[PDB]
Structure formats: C-alpha cells, structure tokens
Amino acid sequence: EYTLDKAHTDVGFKIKHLQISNVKGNFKDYSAVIDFDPASAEFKKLDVTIKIASVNTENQTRDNHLQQDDFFKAKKYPDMTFTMKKYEKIDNEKGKMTGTLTIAGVSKDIVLDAEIGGVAKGKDGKEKIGFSLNGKIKRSDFKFATSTSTITLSDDINLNIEVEANEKE
Amino acid sequence: EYTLDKAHTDVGFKIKHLQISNVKGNFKDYSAVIDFDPASAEFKKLDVTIKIASVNTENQTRDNHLQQDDFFKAKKYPDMTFTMKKYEKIDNEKGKMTGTLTIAGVSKDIVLDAEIGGVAKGKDGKEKIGFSLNGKIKRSDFKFATSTSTITLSDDINLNIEVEANEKE
C-alpha cells in the first residue's frame, strides 16, 4: 500500500575506519654554526638551535597545539638544540654524524647519516656545500609527548635535514 | 666557516599518525514493499532489496573495491535483502522492527528502531508517511569482510534508513 519516493529516501550506512598518514613539518626560525673541511669532506663542528615557536606542519591549529604542555612546552623550553660531538667519515659522499639532541630540556646522543649532495667553489670563487642529515629518533627516548599513546602517534620521528650553505666572512 | 642559505635549507621531520573517521554511504538502486496501517501506526510488511552494485560512499575507487571478493562479492551475490518478520509498537512515533538481513548470502535477524517522522493525508487526499529505521549490525555476525581486521574497519555498521513514501495504486 505504500510506494517509496526515491528522491527523498536514503538507504544509508555509517562505519568507522582508521587511516594512517605522515605528518610532515619543518621550522622557519633556526640558527646554525657550520664548520666543514672541503679538503677531506668532513665536518668539524655543527651546532643547530631551532626556535620551537616556528613549527610549520602546514596546519594552523596543530602548530598552535604543538606549543602546549602535552607537546613542546615552548613557553618553558623555547628552543631545541643539536650539538655535533663526533663525525666519522665513510667516503667523500657519506658519513656518520653523532651529536646531542635536546628536546624540551632532555638530552640524548643520536646518530645521523650525513650525505654530501654537493661540494663546490662558486662563480665568485667562494665555497658552497649541499648536504642532508637523516636519522630516526624515539619520542620515548626524549620522554616527548608522554600522554599521547604510541598507537595514535608513532614513537618514531624521522629526521630529514637538507641544507645548502655558503662560505662565511 | 659556512653560513646556511635559509632559502634552500629545510629542517624537516616526518612522523606517522592514525586518524579515525566515518565512512558514510548509501545505495542508489533499491526496491521495497511497504505495507503500513495509519490507523494504528504499525508496519505490516516491509521488504527491501538493495542492489549492491550501486553503492555510493562518494569515492569512486572505494565503491569499485566494495564489489570485490574481500567485501560484497557483487558478482556472486548481486543484492542484499531485508525482510520484516515482526513489528512491535511502542507508541505512534516509535517502534521496534525485527527482520532478516541477508548480506552476501548470510542471514541474521536484526532489530531496528523505527521512528515515524510524519503520517499524513496529502493535498490530493492520498496517504503519505515519513519514517526512519536505525540500528547497528556486526560485520562478524555476517562474516562480512572477514580479511579486514576490526582494528582497521570497525565491526559495527550503523544503519540509518530515512524513507518518504506515498500511497500506491
């Protein structure tokens, strides 16, 4: 005795699922001391200070949230530091850098794989280099973002530091 | 001895996280027999047949994938059926419908909360009704999408069937 109006009927379902994705991000405000010797292709001194307030995960509310107590605590710990302690060459293209990373006041020694993308004298006769530091740190090791379960946010942070640099004067 | 070119340096990180969301969807091609009595506000007969090939989760590749063997198996089991077996009234607005759902050849008796949104005689003197069936089924109960873990895709499917209908002749 009834006939459905398909134009105003909806046979609907709703089902929850999980999706995995990477959060990519950088920092706009940072400083570094770079001492490198092009004769032997080894680093002598690499010191980075990164201004935590300047994260950019390309998402305004996430970057605001990263400042808070359950993450960086930028109020109390404005910046994170890396200090090279030891470089050990493999060849002119690859090496193993070891330094101290300090995130929100806790320090640990890490290794980065250094890869020299290019070493050169420029048009103006002054040196230029291009290299990348890559490595993996554990949030647990720094007791970072303790209250977020490693299920939701992976314990592994992947570090990828691409840098070009020019000779100082 | 080196000074970084901030315009070609990127201090980057990458970290994996999980995100929970609902998949919402309907079916564009379906048929139903609706027998309802406006004097007492109870259903006498409700039979739906739904053409599985016509899913719409508003995502082309997902709807194609739903057809396959690890989900609906639309090739072998083109359609899913609901047959009301018993309606039990609460009042003129609410009732408890019980029928057999068959998904990909496996049948189970389910309950839906029926909610009559509107019962009326139209401008042309003929009856019209608007109602919604809501309920929750478990994928496990139908052995549906067995190979997908309940972690990735929830075992709970939420059924929301809004229908308007008009008197037949």
> Which phi and psi (to 5°) does residue B29 adopt?
-115, 110
Q: What residue type is assigned to position A155 of the chain?
A: D
Interface of B with A in 58-117 (CB under 8 A): none
Q: Which residues in B115-142 are b (16+ Cβ under 10 Å) and which e?
A: ebeebeeeeeeebbbbbbbebebebeeb
Distances, alpha carbon A20 to alpha carbons A17, A23, B19, B82, B164, in Å: 10, 10, 6, 35, 39
Which residues fall within 8 angstroms of residue A104, CB to CB, at 6 or more apart?
A: A72, A73, A76, A77, A80, A142, A144
Give me the residue label for tokens 């290299």.
A131
End-to-end, the C-alpha distance of chain A in Å comes to 91
Q: What residue type is assigned to position B68 of the chain?
A: Q
- Please report which helix (H) or strand (E) contains residue B161, including its range: strand B153-167
* B contact test, residue of A3, A10, A15 with most B CBs within 10 A: A15
HSE at residue B56, side-chain half, CA atoms within 13 A, is 11
CA gap B46, A41 in Å, rounded: 79
CB of A165 closer than 8 Å to CB of A127? no
Which residue, B30, B28, B33, is CA-closest to B168?
A: B33
Give me the residue label for tokens 């607005």.
B93
| Chain B residues inside the 8 Å CB shell of A26 | 10-13
CA gap B42, B94 in Å, rounded: 9
End-to-end, the C-alpha distance of chain B in Å comes to 91
CA gap B61, B57 in Å, rounded: 10
Q: Which token pair is B110? A: 């389910």
CB of A135 closer than 8 Å to CB of A159? yes
What is the DSSP track for A44-89?
Answer: EEEEEEEEGGGEE-S-HHHHHHHTSTTTT-TTT--EEEEEEEEEEE
CB of B56 closer than 8 Å to CB of B27? yes
CA-CA-CA-CA torsion sign (A54, A102, A99, A94): negative
CB of A22 closer than 8 Å to CB of A46? no
HSE at residue A50, side-chain half, CA atoms within 13 A, is 23
CA gap B108, A131 in Å, rounded: 62
3-state DSSP: chain A helix, strand, coil percent, rounded to 5? 10, 60, 30
Q: If you count them, how many residues does chain B have?
A: 169
Distances, alpha carbon B119 to alpha carbons A3, B83, B126, B129, B152, in Å: 14, 22, 11, 5, 41
* A contact test, residue of B4, B31, B119, B142 with most A CBs within 10 A: B4
C-beta atoms surrounding A103 within 10 Å:
24
- Please report which helix (H) or strand (E) contains residue B141, including its range: none
Q: What kind of experiment solved this structure?
A: X-ray
CA-CA-CA-CA torsion sign (B139, B143, B149, B150): positive
* Burial class, B76, CB count within 10 angstroms (exposed 0-12 / middle 13-18 / buried 19+): exposed
CA gap A59, B64 in Å, rounded: 32
Q: What residue type is assigned to position B54 of the chain?
A: S
CA gap A81, A30 in Å, rounded: 10
* Burial class, A156, CB count within 10 angstroms (exposed 0-12 / middle 13-18 / buried 19+): middle
CA gap A147, A149 in Å, rounded: 6
Give me the residue label for tokens 């315009």.
B7
Domains of chain B, CATH where assigned = 20-169 (2.40.128.110)
| Chain A residues inside the 8 Å CB shell of B158 | 13-15
**Residue of B19, B35, B161 with shortest CB distance to A11:** B161
CB of B4 closer than 8 Å to CB of B82? no
CA gap A42, B89 in Å, rounded: 82
Which residue, A2, A37, A45, is CA-closest to A116?
A: A37
CA gap B22, B59 in Å, rounded: 13
Strands B106-121 and B94-103: antiparallel
Specify which residues A54 forms β-bridges with: none
Distance from the Cα of A28 to chain B's closest Cα (Å) equals 8
Q: What residue type is assigned to position A163 of the chain?
A: V
Q: Which token pair is B133? A: 């069936």
